[PDB]
Design a protein around this ligand. Structure first.
Ligand SMILES: Cc1nc(-c2cn3c(n2)-c2ccc(-c4cnn(C(C)(C)C(N)=O)c4)cc2OCC3)n(C(C)C)n1
Length: 892
């Protein structure tokens, strides 16, 4: 009706394209997704009104909590006999302060009781809010499990909480009525396993093949399961590019009933002997309804990515190019007088049971015919140790063919060491329906593994839907909202590897986004930021449509953020194309004049920070905004924090808006830094890092959190001697606090030395290392990582840094300060090595992004080198010291 049309305009504005463009899409998969996904929308809305208004408040303001209440011993020992000092504020008439000393693990209702006790000594109706931002303690966790409280304990800051009446929070949460949209109102058939025929596909002709007359041309093809070929590639005959017509049947060395569910056809047009791909494309051999492709098809192809010289691109995206003014290959598939469907699960289970029972009857001599057969008995405990050994290798370690036969033959024992599942899966003969059906039944009852281990099974090495479904069930059962937020970037990226629009992973992620608004906010922005990338914009736009339809009132707040970012994009675009040669003064006059237009001024003020939607951005402070000197001329922007107690957190929100460089690699490096820092703290290795906020919001457009009161090394030594840095630090921390500043500088140095060495970050210089007044050192600008150059040391500690560490001693390399510094590095390095699978998998999950430094598994191999995974641990230490000793010309 009329209200649906208004909502469609809002959704269209949020996602950057009109909803009517989805309505015109003819593809049945697209219209079925739009309709069928709505039961996730409904399920989520019903969880939110399950216990109103509390359930609604928990959705908008979910508890920001660590994944477990247990405190590292070094954190706990910062308390006074396990007790914490907190300040509770009450708004009365005027702000009244009440200081409490309570056990670190009282729940909020207890803290509120003690605050009222103290207040009445001055002679379930309240909640606690963090002073200065929109963060609440709505749930009965231990106080120290809230990240704000945990952070205060570690940083030695005083927690400041505000008492607030429940009803004054509930009052401001609009009830949203979710309405089902108008589109919600909507020869035989033979099993694949009965088709007794080999696979054959006809290449007819190519259109839109416009080239520089490049001469002889051919179509290369292959059948793939993930990246694994299921048979040899098959080429057409060569023809000249002026007449690209083949009409050639290609015969594949594979039996049709042996085609696995995720089988794909990968092809390309190649030039010729120097061969070179000109355009590529992949298609699912089964569609989303389990039907084998049939009839004729036109496939619009994709351009070759600069860097790839392979002739096929099977880890490239699957499906037709939306740009129809592109090389278009016409295909024809085999005809069978019948629709052919992948067999249902009951048929697969029957076949697996038949196979298992047959193999259990195999004689000794029969089992000897194949190393993939082993008799139940034979299993010795040395084979058991070898299985356990294999299960501890990292995801990029080669599994030899003999190892694969060995794993497959002992698949049933593997159930007792369930983390071996990823290696067992890469040992399956995916072109054998006998083996695959058995693997299906093993997966359906496989024991659960850790979410960090399950995430590997969603990357591009694991296309099978039963495998990915098991991975999703593991996340559903074990992944906390805290870790889902931590790994959300990767989980969004692996949506791109799903064969179909509707799948278990997207239903899981959408439901979490629609029941936790902190997850939903970044879900929205990660998807929105890629709506320019045409390999994913249909999938992501449809997903965003379904998010926007059910997220409730937050859609209106997102639209405030989208409009503000759009205005900043438009202004910076003008500056870089129409005024780029004018002086700063002139550009600044132009900028202030444009931001003072009333439509602009209103769009740029009074909205939530996309970096952290708990932070309200109030009125701009134009006198504090400025065009920075760095490359691409980013904007330094300053907003008032309108929170009634802003002075207790920060009174101004400073954000850098950068239009022109890709920020996705910085995003990923800052995420990894945070994970490393988390690993170190849990082990009681207190190395303070600074993973400041960074969010890509578009095509080379994004936001960066400003660390207030920090300076580059260069700013410092321009006010110079190699003692200037230490001298600056000592003057900032005179008295009894000098030692704490040296210690914080030493630990922060050790963390960044180790982190940047492991990741192969871009070379450090005195303009991309910064220091806070209190001694905390950190790095900025991570536009390069991994093997972008034989392993570099990006952070070489020059004399200035050693002088600080050694408290001003001339011979700083030969002090016990330096020795304890080295020990921190060694402990930090070995700690990350123990978690190498995590970091390898997090990188592998990002392979399908457009990030140029992260294109193949061999880019990730760099991490295998810096962590020395093929060495022993003591050999790994020795390797790290030599890299350090080489880079510094002595010391280590
Ligand atoms: C890819 C990338 N990343 C960054 C980046 C990332 N950060 C900062 N810049 C950043 C920059 C300045 C400041 C700052 C704070 N106070 N001051 C004042 C006191 C003005 C100073 N020293 O004169 C500067 C703080 C910062 O926070 C760290 C996060 N840049 C930039 C090159 C655009 N480019």
């Amino acid at each position: 009706n009329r209200e649906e049309k208004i909502l469609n305009r809002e959704i269209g504005f949020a996602i950057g394209m009109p909803v009517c463009e989805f309505d015109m899409v003819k593809d049945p998969e697209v219209q079925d997704f739009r309709r069928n996904i709505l039961n996730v929308c409904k399920e989520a809305v019903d969880l939110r009104d399950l216990n109103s208004p509390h359930s609604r408040a928990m959705y908008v303001y979910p508890p920001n909590v660590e994944s477990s209440p247990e405190l590292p011993k070094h954190i706990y020992n910062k308390l006074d006999k396990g007790q914490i000092i907190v300040v509770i504020w009450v708004i009365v008439s005027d702000k009244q302060k009440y200081t409490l000393k309570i056990n670190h693990d009282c729940v909020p209702e207890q803290v509120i009781a003690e605050a009222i006790r103290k207040k009445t000594r001055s002679m379930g109706k309240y909640i606690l809010k963090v002073c200065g931002c929109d963060e609440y303690f709505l749930e009965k966790y231990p106080l120290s499990q809230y990240k704000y409280i945990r952070s205060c304990i570690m940083l030695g800051r005083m927690p400041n909480l505000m008492l607030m009446a429940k009803e004054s929070l509930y009052s401001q949460l609009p009830m949203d009525c979710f309405t089902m949209p108008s589109y919600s109102r909507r020869t035989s058939t033979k099993s694949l396993w009965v088709i007794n025929s080999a696979l054959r596909i006809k290449i007819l002709c190519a259109t839109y093949v416009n080239v520089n007359i490049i001469d002889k041309i051919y179509v290369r093809t292959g059948i793939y399961h993930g990246g694994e070929p299921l048979c040899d590639n098959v080429n057409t005959q060569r023809v000249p590019c002026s007449n690209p017509r083949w009409n050639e049947w290609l015969n594949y060395d594979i039996y049709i009933p042996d085609l696995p569910r995720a089988a794909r056809l990968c092809l390309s047009i190649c030039s010729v002997e120097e061969h070179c791909p000109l355009a590529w494309g992949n298609i699912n051999l089964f569609d989303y309804t389990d039907t084998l492709v049939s009839g004729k098809m036109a496939l619009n192809l994709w351009p070759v990515p600069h860097g790839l010289e392979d002739l096929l691109n099977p880890i490239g995206v699957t499906g037709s190019n939306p740009n129809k003014e592109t090389p278009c290959l016409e295909l024809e598939f085999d005809w069978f007088s019948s629709v052919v469907k992948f067999p249902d699960m009951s048929v697969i289970e029957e076949h697996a049971n038949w196979s298992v029972s047959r193999e259990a009857g195999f004689s000794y001599s029969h089992a000897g015919l194949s190393n993939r057969l082993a008799r139940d008995n034979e299993l010795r405990e040395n084979d058991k140790e070898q299985l356990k050994a294999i299960s501890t290798r990292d995801p990029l370690s080669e599994i030899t063919e003999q190892e694969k036969d060995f794993l497959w033959s002992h698949r049933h024992y593997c159930v007792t060491i369930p983390e071996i599942l990823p290696k067992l899966l890469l040992s399956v003969k995916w072109n054998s329906r006998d083996e695959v059906a058995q693997m299906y039944c093993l997966v359906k009852d496989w024991p659960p593994i850790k979410p960090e281990q399950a995430m590997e099974l969603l990357d591009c090495n694991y296309p099978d839907p039963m495998v990915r479904g098991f991975a999703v069930r593991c996340l559903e059962k074990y992944l906390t909202d805290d870790k889902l937020s931590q790994y959300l970037i990767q989980l969004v990226q692996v949506l791109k590897y799903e064969q179909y629009l509707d799948n278990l992973l997207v239903r899981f992620l959408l439901k979490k986004a629609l029941t936790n608004q902190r997850i939903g906010h970044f879900f929205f922005w990660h998807l929105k930021s890629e709506m320019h990338n045409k390999t994913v914009s249909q999938r992501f736009g449809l997903l965003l449509e379904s998010y926007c339809r059910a997220c409730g009132m937050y859609l209106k707040h997102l639209n405030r953020q989208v409009e503000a970012m759009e205005k900043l994009i438009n202004l910076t675009d003008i500056l870089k194309q129409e005024k780029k040669d004018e002086t700063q003064k002139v550009q600044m006059k132009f900028l202030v004049e444009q931001m003072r237009r009333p439509d602009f001024m209103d769009a740029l003020q009074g909205f939530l920070s996309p970096l952290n939607p708990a932070h309200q951005l109030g009125n701009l402070r134009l006198e504090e905004c400025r065009i920075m000197s760095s490359a691409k001329r980013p904007l330094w922007l300053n907003w008032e924090n309108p929170d009634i107690m802003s002075e207790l957190l920060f009174q101004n929100n400073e954000i850098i808006f950068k239009n022109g460089d890709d920020l996705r690699q910085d995003m990923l490096t800052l995420q990894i830094i945070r994970i490393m820092e988390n690993i170190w703290q849990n082990q009681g290795l207190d190395l303070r890092m600074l993973p400041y906020g960074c969010l890509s919001i578009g095509d080379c457009v994004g936001l960066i959190e400003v660390v207030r009161n920090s300076h580059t090394i260069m700013q410092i030594q321009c006010k110079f001697n190699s003692h200037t840095l230490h001298q600056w630090l000592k003057d900032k921390n005179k008295g009894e606090i000098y030692d704490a500043a040296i210690d914080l500088f030493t630990r922060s140095c050790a963390g960044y030395c180790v982190a940047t060495f492991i990741l192969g970050i871009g070379d450090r210089h005195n303009s991309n290392i910064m220091v806070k007044d209190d001694g905390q050192l950190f790095h900025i600008d991570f536009g390069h990582f991994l093997d972008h150059k034989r392993e570099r040391v990006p952070f070489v500690l020059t004399q200035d840094f050693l002088i600080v560490i050694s408290k001003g001693a001339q011979e700083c390399t030969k002090t016990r300060e330096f020795e304890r510094f080295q020990e921190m590095c060694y402990k930090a390095y070995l700690a990350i090595r123990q978690h190498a699978n995590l970091f390898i998998n997090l990188f592998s999950m990002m392979l399908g992004s457009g990030m140029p430094e992260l294109q193949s598994f061999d880019d990730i191999a760099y991490i295998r080198k810096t962590l020395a995974l093929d060495k022993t641990e003591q050999e790994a230490l020795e390797y790290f010291m030599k890299q350090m000793n080489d880079a510094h010309h002595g010391g280590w």
